[PDB]
Design a protein around this motif. Structure first.
Motif, PDB file in Angstrom:
ATOM      1  N   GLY A 126       0.826  -1.192   0.000  1.00 33.56           N
ATOM      2  CA  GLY A 126       0.000   0.000   0.000  1.00 33.56           C
ATOM      3  C   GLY A 126       0.862   1.243   0.000  1.00 33.56           C
ATOM      4  O   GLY A 126       0.594   2.194  -0.735  1.00 33.56           O
ATOM      5  N   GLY A 127       1.894   1.239   0.837  1.00 30.62           N
ATOM      6  CA  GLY A 127       2.815   2.361   0.901  1.00 30.62           C
ATOM      7  C   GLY A 127       2.410   3.553   1.749  1.00 30.62           C
ATOM      8  O   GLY A 127       1.481   4.288   1.408  1.00 30.62           O
ATOM      9  N   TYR A 128       3.108   3.751   2.862  1.00 29.40           N
ATOM     10  CA  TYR A 128       2.813   4.882   3.726  1.00 29.40           C
ATOM     11  C   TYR A 128       4.011   5.827   3.793  1.00 29.40           C
ATOM     12  O   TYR A 128       3.944   6.970   3.330  1.00 29.40           O
ATOM     13  CB  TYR A 128       2.452   4.416   5.143  1.00 29.40           C
ATOM     14  CG  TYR A 128       2.189   5.571   6.078  1.00 29.40           C
ATOM     15  CD1 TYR A 128       1.047   6.359   5.933  1.00 29.40           C
ATOM     16  CD2 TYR A 128       3.114   5.925   7.061  1.00 29.40           C
ATOM     17  CE1 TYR A 128       0.835   7.478   6.738  1.00 29.40           C
ATOM     18  CE2 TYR A 128       2.915   7.043   7.876  1.00 29.40           C
ATOM     19  CZ  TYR A 128       1.773   7.817   7.704  1.00 29.40           C
ATOM     20  OH  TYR A 128       1.584   8.952   8.464  1.00 29.40           O
ATOM     21  N   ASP A 129       5.104   5.340   4.371  1.00 30.75           N
ATOM     22  CA  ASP A 129       6.328   6.118   4.511  1.00 30.75           C
ATOM     23  C   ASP A 129       7.466   5.126   4.747  1.00 30.75           C
ATOM     24  O   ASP A 129       7.454   4.388   5.736  1.00 30.75           O
ATOM     25  CB  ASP A 129       6.208   7.065   5.702  1.00 30.75           C
ATOM     26  CG  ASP A 129       7.365   8.047   5.790  1.00 30.75           C
ATOM     27  OD1 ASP A 129       8.496   7.696   5.386  1.00 30.75           O
ATOM     28  OD2 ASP A 129       7.141   9.171   6.281  1.00 30.75           O
ATOM     29  N   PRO A 130       8.472   5.105   3.852  1.00 30.32           N
ATOM     30  CA  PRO A 130       9.607   4.185   3.978  1.00 30.32           C
ATOM     31  C   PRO A 130      10.552   4.459   5.141  1.00 30.32           C
ATOM     32  O   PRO A 130      11.344   3.595   5.507  1.00 30.32           O
ATOM     33  CB  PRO A 130      10.302   4.302   2.619  1.00 30.32           C
ATOM     34  CG  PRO A 130      10.070   5.740   2.262  1.00 30.32           C
ATOM     35  CD  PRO A 130       8.617   5.961   2.656  1.00 30.32           C
ATOM     36  N   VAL A 131      10.486   5.663   5.704  1.00 30.31           N
ATOM     37  CA  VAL A 131      11.332   6.022   6.838  1.00 30.31           C
ATOM     38  C   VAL A 131      10.602   5.591   8.115  1.00 30.31           C
ATOM     39  O   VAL A 131       9.570   6.160   8.475  1.00 30.31           O
ATOM     40  CB  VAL A 131      11.594   7.540   6.884  1.00 30.31           C
ATOM     41  CG1 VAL A 131      12.443   7.892   8.101  1.00 30.31           C
ATOM     42  CG2 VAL A 131      12.301   7.977   5.604  1.00 30.31           C
ATOM     43  N   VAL A 132      11.149   4.579   8.784  1.00 25.02           N
ATOM     44  CA  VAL A 132      10.559   4.027  10.001  1.00 25.02           C
ATOM     45  C   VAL A 132      11.425   4.264  11.238  1.00 25.02           C
ATOM     46  O   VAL A 132      12.611   3.931  11.249  1.00 25.02           O
ATOM     47  CB  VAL A 132      10.342   2.496   9.847  1.00 25.02           C
ATOM     48  CG1 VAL A 132       9.766   1.907  11.128  1.00 25.02           C
ATOM     49  CG2 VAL A 132       9.421   2.217   8.662  1.00 25.02           C
ATOM     50  N   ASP A 301      14.759  -6.089   9.365  1.00 23.69           N
ATOM     51  CA  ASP A 301      15.116  -5.997   7.953  1.00 23.69           C
ATOM     52  C   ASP A 301      13.939  -6.468   7.093  1.00 23.69           C
ATOM     53  O   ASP A 301      13.765  -6.029   5.948  1.00 23.69           O
ATOM     54  CB  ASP A 301      16.359  -6.849   7.675  1.00 23.69           C
ATOM     55  CG  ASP A 301      17.538  -6.451   8.548  1.00 23.69           C
ATOM     56  OD1 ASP A 301      18.032  -5.312   8.400  1.00 23.69           O
ATOM     57  OD2 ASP A 301      17.960  -7.269   9.392  1.00 23.69           O
ATOM     58  N   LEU A 302      13.135  -7.372   7.645  1.00 20.21           N
ATOM     59  CA  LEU A 302      11.966  -7.870   6.936  1.00 20.21           C
ATOM     60  C   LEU A 302      10.770  -7.028   7.362  1.00 20.21           C
ATOM     61  O   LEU A 302       9.945  -6.615   6.542  1.00 20.21           O
ATOM     62  CB  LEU A 302      11.703  -9.334   7.297  1.00 20.21           C
ATOM     63  CG  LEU A 302      12.698 -10.399   6.826  1.00 20.21           C
ATOM     64  CD1 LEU A 302      12.330 -11.757   7.441  1.00 20.21           C
ATOM     65  CD2 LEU A 302      12.681 -10.474   5.300  1.00 20.21           C
ATOM     66  N   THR A 303      10.710  -6.760   8.663  1.00 15.70           N
ATOM     67  CA  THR A 303       9.626  -6.003   9.267  1.00 15.70           C
ATOM     68  C   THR A 303       9.475  -4.567   8.777  1.00 15.70           C
ATOM     69  O   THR A 303       8.364  -4.048   8.731  1.00 15.70           O
ATOM     70  CB  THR A 303       9.772  -5.995  10.805  1.00 15.70           C
ATOM     71  OG1 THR A 303       9.853  -7.350  11.274  1.00 15.70           O
ATOM     72  CG2 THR A 303       8.568  -5.305  11.466  1.00 15.70           C
ATOM     73  N   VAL A 304      10.576  -3.929   8.400  1.00 18.43           N
ATOM     74  CA  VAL A 304      10.509  -2.550   7.939  1.00 18.43           C
ATOM     75  C   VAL A 304       9.452  -2.351   6.845  1.00 18.43           C
ATOM     76  O   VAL A 304       8.789  -1.312   6.804  1.00 18.43           O
ATOM     77  CB  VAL A 304      11.892  -2.054   7.424  1.00 18.43           C
ATOM     78  CG1 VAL A 304      12.335  -2.872   6.221  1.00 18.43           C
ATOM     79  CG2 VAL A 304      11.827  -0.558   7.091  1.00 18.43           C
ATOM     80  N   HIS A 305       9.282  -3.345   5.977  1.00 17.26           N
ATOM     81  CA  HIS A 305       8.302  -3.250   4.899  1.00 17.26           C
ATOM     82  C   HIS A 305       6.868  -3.201   5.403  1.00 17.26           C
ATOM     83  O   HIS A 305       6.037  -2.470   4.853  1.00 17.26           O
ATOM     84  CB  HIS A 305       8.487  -4.412   3.921  1.00 17.26           C
ATOM     85  CG  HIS A 305       9.704  -4.265   3.064  1.00 17.26           C
ATOM     86  ND1 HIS A 305       9.786  -3.338   2.048  1.00 17.26           N
ATOM     87  CD2 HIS A 305      10.916  -4.865   3.126  1.00 17.26           C
ATOM     88  CE1 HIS A 305      10.998  -3.369   1.524  1.00 17.26           C
ATOM     89  NE2 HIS A 305      11.705  -4.287   2.162  1.00 17.26           N
ATOM     90  N   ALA A 306       6.578  -3.966   6.451  1.00 18.56           N
ATOM     91  CA  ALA A 306       5.235  -3.970   7.029  1.00 18.56           C
ATOM     92  C   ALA A 306       4.928  -2.642   7.729  1.00 18.56           C
ATOM     93  O   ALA A 306       3.845  -2.085   7.561  1.00 18.56           O
ATOM     94  CB  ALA A 306       5.089  -5.120   8.014  1.00 18.56           C
ATOM     95  N   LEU A 307       5.883  -2.122   8.499  1.00 24.20           N
ATOM     96  CA  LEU A 307       5.646  -0.871   9.218  1.00 24.20           C
ATOM     97  C   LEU A 307       5.722   0.374   8.341  1.00 24.20           C
ATOM     98  O   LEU A 307       5.265   1.455   8.735  1.00 24.20           O
ATOM     99  CB  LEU A 307       6.609  -0.752  10.408  1.00 24.20           C
ATOM    100  CG  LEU A 307       6.363  -1.856  11.456  1.00 24.20           C
ATOM    101  CD1 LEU A 307       7.428  -1.795  12.550  1.00 24.20           C
ATOM    102  CD2 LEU A 307       4.956  -1.706  12.047  1.00 24.20           C
ATOM    103  N   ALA A 308       6.286   0.220   7.151  1.00 25.60           N
ATOM    104  CA  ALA A 308       6.401   1.328   6.210  1.00 25.60           C
ATOM    105  C   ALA A 308       5.100   1.419   5.400  1.00 25.60           C
ATOM    106  O   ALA A 308       4.886   2.373   4.658  1.00 25.60           O
ATOM    107  CB  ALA A 308       7.599   1.100   5.267  1.00 25.60           C
ATOM    108  N   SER A 309       4.234   0.421   5.554  1.00 23.28           N
ATOM    109  CA  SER A 309       2.976   0.406   4.822  1.00 23.28           C
ATOM    110  C   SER A 309       1.755   0.674   5.696  1.00 23.28           C
ATOM    111  O   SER A 309       0.634   0.613   5.205  1.00 23.28           O
ATOM    112  CB  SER A 309       2.795  -0.934   4.105  1.00 23.28           C
ATOM    113  OG  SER A 309       2.559  -1.973   5.044  1.00 23.28           O
ATOM    114  N   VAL A 310       1.962   0.951   6.983  1.00 22.54           N
ATOM    115  CA  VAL A 310       0.839   1.249   7.867  1.00 22.54           C
ATOM    116  C   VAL A 310       1.021   2.641   8.462  1.00 22.54           C
ATOM    117  O   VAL A 310       2.142   3.079   8.733  1.00 22.54           O
ATOM    118  CB  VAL A 310       0.677   0.190   8.995  1.00 22.54           C
ATOM    119  CG1 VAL A 310       0.473  -1.189   8.374  1.00 22.54           C
ATOM    120  CG2 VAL A 310       1.875   0.200   9.920  1.00 22.54           C
ATOM    121  N   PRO A 311      -0.088   3.357   8.680  1.00 20.58           N
ATOM    122  CA  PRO A 311      -0.017   4.708   9.232  1.00 20.58           C
ATOM    123  C   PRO A 311       0.240   4.856  10.727  1.00 20.58           C
ATOM    124  O   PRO A 311       0.815   5.859  11.160  1.00 20.58           O
ATOM    125  CB  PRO A 311      -1.365   5.303   8.821  1.00 20.58           C
ATOM    126  CG  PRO A 311      -2.280   4.141   8.972  1.00 20.58           C
ATOM    127  CD  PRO A 311      -1.482   2.982   8.374  1.00 20.58           C
TER     128      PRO A 311
END
Ligand code: NA
Ligand code: NA
Lengths: 357, 357
Positions: A126-132, A301-311
């Protein structure tokens, strides 16, 4: 169609002897990697781990049980595969190590979907913000206060602007002095969280919460065992702190129960044992519906993608980098999800071969 | 002190036509045996099984992870060993297959204690009544109605005075006609129970119960998935039937949750996956405290000692005998816990050796 599934088990040694209140003696951890190749030659990577035990069991579930749900199946139907795997290991399963086995596979399937779509997972989701934002998760219960401060200095120099330390010492007094020491060291407004790793009884947790209140901790993680919905709800009601939990919950239903019972205020799923990105995102939706933030535990390293896609994401635990092609660097308290297709993680399997078990 | 721990895995082939709503066709059950020997040469036998998959994983847990909690430990401290095993496999575990691995070990430890005390387990546990009533549990969902009645005659010939049949067909109408035919065949005074094996949705289960109410079923087992406490409590409130459940619950906490939320009216623990006799008896205590009866699922050869030691037991599920020495005979609807030291079960390991994997 899936044409090959490779399962491997490694015993990665820890640079230092990490310790917590429940299984302290951590000299090494087991890594189970899963590589799934489709008919076009693309290979997806997925992995999970355990601490000291159960690694071989997990690897065995992937190799002997789940393999049959994968070979010959269309890898693009991830949800369909997830359900088939859940039911394949349901008898005597429905939670437990089977969910970690499933997570590794799920993660590899998503990696594969991202590669074929030529897009990083955070955008695919979905894409929210890549900076986590991240926090350093120290496994330092038996670490001398002096070295605790030193470790903190290293986290700071490393880019971290939030730190988590372990609590749950036999004598509450010892946790109080250590938290007090690190608080004055890090400063007044520095985010400092604590992790009791299920060490306290319900009464003990609340007693500990009162004693640690003066230090304005960002949150208290796993005050007691997670199975106790009633008791944890009581800790939430009386501790006056954010109560983080979830690394030990293994099904969407576990999180549903906890949320519904108000037994935690901040969910912390671990993509490597909750069921992969598939289930992780569902837990994320539950948290969003309940007006809760979302954090995580493990494999950032895997999780960053999940948290970068949620608000509603908040500080992600960023406690294998030595075996990674290009691990993310921490800058000003954050990491940036990479833009390569899939999750972008590449392990040096040649170098890992040496630690194969 | 424990000096030897032998773990073996056998693939016991199962005939075709053994089917239920969600597990599908059962090709075989994977038997995991555990034989423990103490410094005096006494050996205790314990075992558990899975259906179709997960067996190798279970055996791996006992052999690779739990062995270290056993060797050199005093077998007489069953509870201490139970806890160390629970914690050794707690990360990524806390339920799941690890609980079946644990149960096998626990059962062997109790067997050893009974052998050393020269007393049958039902007496060691306290002692209520060795004569335990049973019911025949058929795995006959796809079995034709004519064959269903036929199977019923064989059960009666076998001494059974209570029978359970499978439900959960794609069309409720089919289940209704089958239940009606069996009720007609057995007479409305015969205890007839049905097992949906989690097939129905909450609404579907209530609808099924309304349709089956005319046949006065003794109970409906697992109407929907066990993870749903809220939905199951709703089925309890609206179905007008005894709701049995528990074969898929794997921790004392699961049973605690279900009982507290009123999501079932009759608990059905399985000694081979709930944690052995140790946990089984704790679940029985919860049932007694809640004014509930207690039934069970699986390995009645082992389970007989548990239900023979509790006052609120009801029909025990009965149906590996080909590999047993002195299997209990069913007489006038009951079986008798043997008075031999321990659980009294003896397996032909020479014959089983043939099916070793
Ligand atoms: Na924790
Ligand atoms: Na059932």
């Amino acid at each position: 169609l899936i044409e090959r599934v490779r399962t491997d088990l490694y015993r990665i040694p820890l640079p230092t002897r990490l310790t917590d209140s429940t299984h302290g003696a951590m000299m090494d951890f087991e890594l189970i990697t899963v590589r799934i190749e489709d008919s076009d030659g693309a290979t997806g990577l997925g992995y999970t781990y355990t601490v000291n035990h159960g690694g071989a069991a997990v690897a065995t579930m992937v190799d002997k049980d789940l393999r049959g749900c994968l070979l010959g199946a269309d890898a693009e139907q991830i949800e369909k595969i997830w359900q088939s795997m859940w039911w394949r290991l349901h008898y005597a399963g429905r939670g437990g190590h089977a969910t970690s086995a499933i997570s590794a596979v799920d993660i590899a399937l998503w990696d594969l979907k991202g590669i074929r779509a030529r897009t990083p997972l955070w955008k695919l989701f979905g894409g929210y913000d890549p900076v986590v934002p991240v926090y350093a998760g120290g496994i330092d219960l038996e670490l001398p206060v002096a070295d605790l401060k030193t470790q903190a200095d290293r986290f700071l120099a490393g880019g971290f602007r939030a730190i988590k330390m372990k609590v749950g010492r036999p004598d509450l007094k010892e946790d109080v002095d250590r938290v007090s020491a690190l608080r004055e060291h890090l400063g007044d407004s520095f985010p400092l969280m604590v992790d009791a790793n299920m060490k306290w009884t319900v009464d003990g947790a609340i007693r500990a919460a009162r004693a640690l209140a003066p230090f304005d901790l960002h949150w208290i993680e796993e005050p007691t065992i997670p199975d106790d919905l009633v008791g944890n709800a009581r800790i939430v009601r009386e501790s006056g702190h954010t109560i983080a939990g979830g690394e030990n919950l293994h099904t969407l239903y576990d999180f549903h129960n906890a949320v519904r019972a108000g037994s935690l205020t901040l969910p912390e799923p671990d993509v490597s044992n909750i069921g992969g990105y598939t289930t992780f995102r569902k837990v994320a939706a539950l948290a969003e519906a309940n007006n809760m933030l979302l954090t995580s535990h493990g494999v950032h390293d895997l999780t960053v993608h999940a948290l970068a896609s949620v608000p509603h994401r908040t500080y992600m635990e960023a406690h294998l980098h030595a075996y990674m092609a290009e691990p993310m660097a921490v800058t000003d308290g954050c990491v940036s999800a990479p833009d390569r297709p899939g999750h972008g993680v590449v392990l040096d399997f040649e170098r890992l071969g040496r630690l194969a078990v």
